[PDB]
Amino acid sequence: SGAIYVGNYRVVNRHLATHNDWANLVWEDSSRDLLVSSTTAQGCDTIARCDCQTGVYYCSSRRKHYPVSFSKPSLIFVEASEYYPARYQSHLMLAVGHSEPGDCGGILRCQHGVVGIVSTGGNGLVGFADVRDLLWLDE
Numbered sequence: 001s002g003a004i005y006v007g008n009y010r011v012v013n014r015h016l017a018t019h020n021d022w023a024n025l026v027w028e029d030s031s032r033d034l035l036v037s038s039t040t041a042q043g044c045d046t047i048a049r050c051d052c053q054t055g056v057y058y059c060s061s062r063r064k065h066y067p068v069s070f071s072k073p074s075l076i077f078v079e080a081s082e083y084y085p086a087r088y089q090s091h092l093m094l095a096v097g098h099s100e101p102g103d104c105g106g107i108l109r110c111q112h113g114v115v116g117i118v119s120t121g122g123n124g125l126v127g128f129a130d131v132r133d134l135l136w137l138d139e
């Protein structure tokens with residue numbers, strides 16, 4: 001679990017969005033596994049605006065932050081799970097690292113700020129849903 005809190009927005013994995021997030025929906029995209037809902041309070045996370053390919057992510061299944069190298073956002077085949085059938089997920093970045101289903105929501109950060117959140121993984125990989133292209137998160 002986990003979310004990014006920037007301005008009056010809350011960014012979560014779409015598959016983990018609550019019925020309360022859908023009522024307060026701003027934008028969602030099933031192909032990216034993202035949902036953004038509006039908040040009453042102002043958030044303080046800064047979104048990165050960069051092309052960094054190294055960063056640090058939080059892994060809740062190890063209670064540890066790990067440094068990683070990750071691929072640029074791309075269209076990647078993601079195996080079936082209880083939340084989606086087997087499909088291509090867009091704007092996804094992969095790294096070699098540990099992840100379990102419940103690690104979704106953990107933040108990936110670089111020197112510039114938040115890059116994205118854990119969204120996919122298994123078999124020694126971890127995938128992150130990029131948020132750096134969502135320029136409107138800053139307004």
Ligand SMILES: COc1ccncc1CC(=O)N1CC[C@H](C(N)=O)C1
Nearest residue numbers: 033081083099100101119120121122
């Ligand atoms: C961190 O994800 C995992 C880690 C280990 N085995 C499996 C997984 C993958 C997983 O459970 N999901 C839930 C839906 C999500 C998606 N974006 O399609 C992928």
Ligand SMILES: [Zn+2]
Nearest residue numbers: 050052110112
């Ligand atoms: Zn960066």
